[PDB]
Design a protein around this ligand. Structure first.
Ligand SMILES: Cc1c(-c2cccc3ncccc23)ccc2nc[nH]c(=O)c12
Length: 298
Protein backbone atom coordinates (compact mmCIF):
# COMPACT_ATOMS: atom_id res chain seq x y z
CA UNK A 1 0.00 0.00 0.00
CA UNK A 2 2.86 2.40 0.83
CA UNK A 3 4.65 3.20 -2.44
CA UNK A 4 7.09 5.92 -3.46
CA UNK A 5 4.58 7.52 -5.85
CA UNK A 6 2.35 8.39 -2.88
CA UNK A 7 5.01 9.96 -0.62
CA UNK A 8 5.55 13.72 -0.58
CA UNK A 9 9.20 14.62 0.00
CA UNK A 10 9.08 17.49 2.51
CA UNK A 11 12.55 18.07 3.96
CA UNK A 12 16.07 16.74 3.47
CA UNK A 13 17.39 15.60 6.86
CA UNK A 14 20.56 13.87 5.67
CA UNK A 15 23.12 13.75 2.86
CA UNK A 16 26.22 11.65 2.31
CA UNK A 17 28.02 9.28 0.00
CA UNK A 18 25.08 6.92 0.62
CA UNK A 19 22.58 9.30 -0.97
CA UNK A 20 20.00 11.36 0.92
CA UNK A 21 17.51 10.92 3.74
CA UNK A 22 14.19 12.73 3.49
CA UNK A 23 11.29 13.38 5.78
CA UNK A 24 8.25 12.44 3.71
CA UNK A 25 4.50 12.73 4.18
CA UNK A 26 2.47 9.59 3.47
CA UNK A 27 -1.22 10.19 4.22
CA UNK A 28 -0.30 13.00 6.61
CA UNK A 29 1.97 10.78 8.71
CA UNK A 30 5.72 11.40 8.63
CA UNK A 31 7.90 8.73 7.03
CA UNK A 32 11.65 8.45 6.56
CA UNK A 33 12.93 7.88 3.02
CA UNK A 34 16.53 7.02 2.13
CA UNK A 35 17.19 7.64 -1.56
CA UNK A 36 20.34 5.68 -2.38
CA UNK A 37 23.16 7.13 -4.43
CA UNK A 38 24.24 5.30 -7.56
CA UNK A 39 27.49 4.27 -5.88
CA UNK A 40 25.58 2.68 -2.96
CA UNK A 41 23.04 0.63 -4.92
CA UNK A 42 24.38 -2.64 -3.51
CA UNK A 43 23.50 -1.50 0.03
CA UNK A 44 19.90 -0.98 -1.10
CA UNK A 45 19.77 -4.54 -2.44
CA UNK A 46 21.17 -5.90 0.83
CA UNK A 47 18.75 -3.91 3.01
CA UNK A 48 15.84 -4.87 0.76
CA UNK A 49 16.82 -8.51 1.25
CA UNK A 50 17.04 -8.25 5.06
CA UNK A 51 13.81 -6.28 5.46
CA UNK A 52 11.74 -8.18 2.88
CA UNK A 53 13.11 -11.73 2.71
CA UNK A 54 14.54 -12.13 6.22
CA UNK A 55 11.66 -9.96 7.49
CA UNK A 56 13.80 -8.20 10.09
CA UNK A 57 11.61 -6.57 12.75
CA UNK A 58 12.41 -5.60 16.36
CA UNK A 59 11.54 -2.64 18.57
CA UNK A 60 15.24 -1.67 18.71
CA UNK A 61 15.70 -1.96 14.92
CA UNK A 62 14.57 0.87 12.64
CA UNK A 63 11.02 0.06 11.57
CA UNK A 64 10.87 -0.93 7.91
CA UNK A 65 7.83 0.14 5.85
CA UNK A 66 8.58 -0.74 2.22
CA UNK A 67 11.18 -1.03 -0.51
CA UNK A 68 10.40 0.70 -3.78
CA UNK A 69 11.88 1.94 -7.04
CA UNK A 70 10.80 5.22 -8.62
CA UNK A 71 11.82 6.62 -12.00
CA UNK A 72 12.36 10.37 -11.78
CA UNK A 73 14.53 12.77 -13.78
CA UNK A 74 15.24 10.08 -16.40
CA UNK A 75 16.88 7.91 -13.72
CA UNK A 76 15.69 5.15 -11.39
CA UNK A 77 15.96 5.79 -7.65
CA UNK A 78 16.10 3.01 -5.05
CA UNK A 79 14.03 3.95 -1.98
CA UNK A 80 13.98 2.49 1.53
CA UNK A 81 10.93 3.75 3.44
CA UNK A 82 10.98 3.50 7.25
CA UNK A 83 9.34 4.89 10.37
CA UNK A 84 10.20 8.52 11.15
CA UNK A 85 11.55 9.42 14.60
CA UNK A 86 11.10 13.08 15.53
CA UNK A 87 14.06 12.99 17.95
CA UNK A 88 16.46 12.10 15.12
CA UNK A 89 19.77 10.30 15.13
CA UNK A 90 21.62 9.59 18.35
CA UNK A 91 24.48 11.62 16.85
CA UNK A 92 22.41 14.79 16.52
CA UNK A 93 20.47 14.09 19.72
CA UNK A 94 23.50 13.89 22.01
CA UNK A 95 24.63 17.28 20.73
CA UNK A 96 21.35 18.93 21.76
CA UNK A 97 20.86 17.62 25.32
CA UNK A 98 22.55 15.99 28.30
CA UNK A 99 21.37 12.85 30.07
CA UNK A 100 20.57 11.74 33.59
CA UNK A 101 21.39 8.23 34.78
CA UNK A 102 18.09 6.65 33.79
CA UNK A 103 18.13 8.13 30.29
CA UNK A 104 21.76 7.16 29.73
CA UNK A 105 21.16 3.53 30.65
CA UNK A 106 17.87 3.30 28.75
CA UNK A 107 19.74 4.40 25.61
CA UNK A 108 22.69 2.02 25.80
CA UNK A 109 20.60 -0.96 26.91
CA UNK A 110 18.18 -0.44 24.03
CA UNK A 111 21.13 -0.49 21.60
CA UNK A 112 22.51 -3.65 23.25
CA UNK A 113 19.08 -5.23 22.95
CA UNK A 114 18.97 -4.28 19.28
CA UNK A 115 22.42 -5.73 18.64
CA UNK A 116 21.71 -8.93 20.57
CA UNK A 117 18.61 -9.41 18.40
CA UNK A 118 20.75 -9.21 15.26
CA UNK A 119 23.54 -11.50 16.50
CA UNK A 120 21.34 -14.30 17.86
CA UNK A 121 19.94 -16.85 15.41
CA UNK A 122 16.37 -18.09 15.89
CA UNK A 123 16.18 -21.73 14.88
CA UNK A 124 13.45 -23.73 13.17
CA UNK A 125 11.06 -23.29 10.27
CA UNK A 126 11.53 -19.82 8.76
CA UNK A 127 14.00 -18.99 11.53
CA UNK A 128 16.00 -15.80 11.46
CA UNK A 129 19.76 -16.15 10.84
CA UNK A 130 22.45 -14.56 12.95
CA UNK A 131 23.24 -11.09 11.60
CA UNK A 132 26.27 -8.84 12.06
CA UNK A 133 25.77 -5.14 11.32
CA UNK A 134 29.33 -3.96 10.40
CA UNK A 135 28.64 -0.19 10.36
CA UNK A 136 27.30 0.52 13.84
CA UNK A 137 27.75 4.19 14.79
CA UNK A 138 25.82 7.01 16.41
CA UNK A 139 24.60 8.29 13.04
CA UNK A 140 23.12 4.83 12.34
CA UNK A 141 21.08 4.94 15.58
CA UNK A 142 17.79 6.79 16.07
CA UNK A 143 16.11 7.98 19.28
CA UNK A 144 12.47 7.05 19.79
CA UNK A 145 9.85 8.96 21.77
CA UNK A 146 10.01 6.46 24.64
CA UNK A 147 13.70 7.24 25.20
CA UNK A 148 14.94 3.99 23.65
CA UNK A 149 16.91 3.80 20.41
CA UNK A 150 16.88 1.59 17.33
CA UNK A 151 19.64 0.46 14.96
CA UNK A 152 19.47 1.34 11.26
CA UNK A 153 21.44 0.79 8.04
CA UNK A 154 21.73 -2.94 7.23
CA UNK A 155 23.60 -2.31 3.97
CA UNK A 156 26.66 -4.29 5.10
CA UNK A 157 24.86 -7.01 7.06
CA UNK A 158 26.47 -10.46 7.15
CA UNK A 159 24.37 -13.52 7.96
CA UNK A 160 25.10 -16.99 9.30
CA UNK A 161 23.13 -20.17 10.03
CA UNK A 162 24.52 -22.67 12.53
CA UNK A 163 22.69 -25.60 10.91
CA UNK A 164 24.12 -25.35 7.38
CA UNK A 165 27.13 -23.39 8.68
CA UNK A 166 26.43 -21.12 5.69
CA UNK A 167 28.11 -17.71 5.83
CA UNK A 168 26.56 -15.02 3.60
CA UNK A 169 28.80 -11.94 3.33
CA UNK A 170 26.96 -10.54 0.31
CA UNK A 171 28.71 -8.59 -2.43
CA UNK A 172 29.19 -4.94 -1.53
CA UNK A 173 32.23 -2.76 -2.33
CA UNK A 174 31.11 -0.50 0.54
CA UNK A 175 33.50 -0.31 3.49
CA UNK A 176 32.47 0.52 7.04
CA UNK A 177 32.98 3.94 8.56
CA UNK A 178 36.73 4.27 9.06
CA UNK A 179 36.42 6.19 12.35
CA UNK A 180 34.71 3.16 13.94
CA UNK A 181 36.85 0.46 12.32
CA UNK A 182 38.14 -2.24 14.65
CA UNK A 183 41.90 -2.92 14.80
CA UNK A 184 41.71 -6.34 13.15
CA UNK A 185 40.09 -4.56 10.19
CA UNK A 186 42.64 -1.74 10.02
CA UNK A 187 45.57 -4.19 9.97
CA UNK A 188 43.78 -6.87 7.92
CA UNK A 189 44.13 -9.79 10.33
CA UNK A 190 40.36 -10.25 10.62
CA UNK A 191 39.24 -13.77 9.67
CA UNK A 192 36.76 -13.04 6.89
CA UNK A 193 35.33 -16.58 6.61
CA UNK A 194 34.44 -16.80 10.31
CA UNK A 195 31.11 -15.31 11.34
CA UNK A 196 32.24 -14.53 14.89
CA UNK A 197 34.75 -12.07 13.40
CA UNK A 198 31.97 -9.76 12.21
CA UNK A 199 30.14 -9.90 15.54
CA UNK A 200 33.32 -8.87 17.34
CA UNK A 201 33.59 -5.90 14.98
CA UNK A 202 30.11 -4.81 16.07
CA UNK A 203 31.17 -5.01 19.73
CA UNK A 204 34.17 -2.74 19.14
CA UNK A 205 31.91 -0.18 17.46
CA UNK A 206 29.30 -0.56 20.20
CA UNK A 207 31.96 0.21 22.80
CA UNK A 208 32.63 3.48 20.99
CA UNK A 209 28.94 4.44 20.92
CA UNK A 210 28.69 3.69 24.64
CA UNK A 211 31.62 6.08 25.12
CA UNK A 212 29.80 8.75 23.09
CA UNK A 213 26.66 8.38 25.21
CA UNK A 214 28.27 8.15 28.65
CA UNK A 215 30.18 11.41 28.10
CA UNK A 216 26.80 13.18 28.02
CA UNK A 217 25.59 11.77 31.35
CA UNK A 218 25.76 14.40 34.08
CA UNK A 219 27.42 13.46 37.36
CA UNK A 220 27.99 15.87 40.26
CA UNK A 221 27.29 18.84 38.01
CA UNK A 222 29.89 17.80 35.41
CA UNK A 223 29.47 16.58 31.83
CA UNK A 224 31.64 16.28 28.72
CA UNK A 225 30.75 18.00 25.46
CA UNK A 226 29.68 15.66 22.72
CA UNK A 227 32.67 14.42 20.76
CA UNK A 228 33.03 11.61 18.20
CA UNK A 229 35.47 8.77 18.91
CA UNK A 230 39.13 9.71 18.47
CA UNK A 231 38.21 13.37 17.95
CA UNK A 232 41.59 14.38 19.38
CA UNK A 233 43.94 12.20 17.28
CA UNK A 234 42.32 12.10 13.81
CA UNK A 235 40.88 14.73 11.47
CA UNK A 236 37.40 14.81 9.97
CA UNK A 237 36.79 12.08 7.39
CA UNK A 238 39.81 10.19 8.78
CA UNK A 239 41.91 8.13 6.40
CA UNK A 240 42.60 4.43 6.74
CA UNK A 241 46.23 5.19 7.61
CA UNK A 242 45.13 7.72 10.23
CA UNK A 243 43.02 5.13 12.05
CA UNK A 244 45.64 2.38 12.00
CA UNK A 245 48.25 4.73 13.50
CA UNK A 246 45.93 5.60 16.40
CA UNK A 247 44.16 2.29 16.99
CA UNK A 248 46.86 -0.22 15.96
CA UNK A 249 50.30 1.40 16.11
CA UNK A 250 49.76 3.51 19.23
CA UNK A 251 47.17 1.10 20.69
CA UNK A 252 45.11 4.14 21.68
CA UNK A 253 41.54 4.09 22.99
CA UNK A 254 38.96 6.72 23.98
CA UNK A 255 40.03 8.35 27.24
CA UNK A 256 37.97 7.84 30.40
CA UNK A 257 37.31 11.20 32.12
CA UNK A 258 38.46 11.15 35.72
CA UNK A 259 35.08 12.46 36.89
CA UNK A 260 33.58 9.10 35.87
CA UNK A 261 35.28 7.49 38.87
CA UNK A 262 33.08 9.57 41.20
CA UNK A 263 29.88 7.98 39.82
CA UNK A 264 29.05 4.27 40.21
CA UNK A 265 27.15 4.08 36.91
CA UNK A 266 29.88 5.68 34.81
CA UNK A 267 32.56 3.61 36.56
CA UNK A 268 30.75 0.40 35.59
CA UNK A 269 30.18 1.73 32.07
CA UNK A 270 33.87 2.63 31.85
CA UNK A 271 34.72 -1.00 32.62
CA UNK A 272 32.10 -2.27 30.15
CA UNK A 273 33.40 0.08 27.45
CA UNK A 274 37.00 -1.09 27.75
CA UNK A 275 35.96 -4.76 27.59
CA UNK A 276 34.74 -4.05 24.06
CA UNK A 277 38.09 -2.59 23.02
CA UNK A 278 40.57 -5.46 23.40
CA UNK A 279 43.06 -5.66 20.56
CA UNK A 280 42.47 -9.43 20.79
CA UNK A 281 39.03 -9.69 19.14
CA UNK A 282 38.13 -12.89 21.01
CA UNK A 283 38.55 -11.23 24.43
CA UNK A 284 35.68 -8.78 23.82
CA UNK A 285 32.32 -9.32 25.52
CA UNK A 286 29.40 -10.69 23.52
CA UNK A 287 26.29 -8.67 22.76
CA UNK A 288 24.18 -10.82 25.09
CA UNK A 289 26.73 -10.33 27.88
CA UNK A 290 26.69 -6.57 27.36
CA UNK A 291 22.89 -6.61 27.47
CA UNK A 292 22.90 -8.65 30.69
CA UNK A 293 25.41 -6.33 32.36
CA UNK A 294 23.52 -3.21 31.29
CA UNK A 295 20.34 -4.72 32.71
CA UNK A 296 22.00 -4.97 36.15
CA UNK A 297 23.78 -1.60 36.25
CA UNK A 298 21.76 1.21 37.86
C1 LIG B 1 15.36 7.03 10.21
C2 LIG B 1 16.23 8.25 10.01
C3 LIG B 1 17.47 8.16 9.33
C4 LIG B 1 18.04 6.98 8.85
C5 LIG B 1 19.28 6.65 9.41
C6 LIG B 1 19.97 5.50 9.01
C7 LIG B 1 19.42 4.68 8.04
C8 LIG B 1 18.16 5.00 7.47
N1 LIG B 1 17.65 4.15 6.51
C9 LIG B 1 16.47 4.40 5.91
C10 LIG B 1 15.74 5.53 6.27
C11 LIG B 1 16.23 6.41 7.23
C12 LIG B 1 17.48 6.13 7.85
C13 LIG B 1 18.26 9.29 9.18
C14 LIG B 1 17.83 10.52 9.64
C15 LIG B 1 16.58 10.63 10.31
N2 LIG B 1 16.18 11.94 10.78
C16 LIG B 1 14.92 12.11 11.45
N3 LIG B 1 14.08 10.98 11.66
C17 LIG B 1 14.46 9.72 11.21
O1 LIG B 1 13.69 8.80 11.42
C18 LIG B 1 15.78 9.53 10.49
Amino acid sequence: RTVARDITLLECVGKGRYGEVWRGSWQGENVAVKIFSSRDEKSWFRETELYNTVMLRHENILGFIASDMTSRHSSTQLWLITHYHEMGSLYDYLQLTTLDTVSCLRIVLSIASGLAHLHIEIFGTQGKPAIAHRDLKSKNILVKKNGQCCIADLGLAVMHSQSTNQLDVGNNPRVGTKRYMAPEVLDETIQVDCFDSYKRVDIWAFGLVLWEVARRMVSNGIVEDYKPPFYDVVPNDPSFEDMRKVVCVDQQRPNIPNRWFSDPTLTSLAKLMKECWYQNPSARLTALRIKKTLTKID
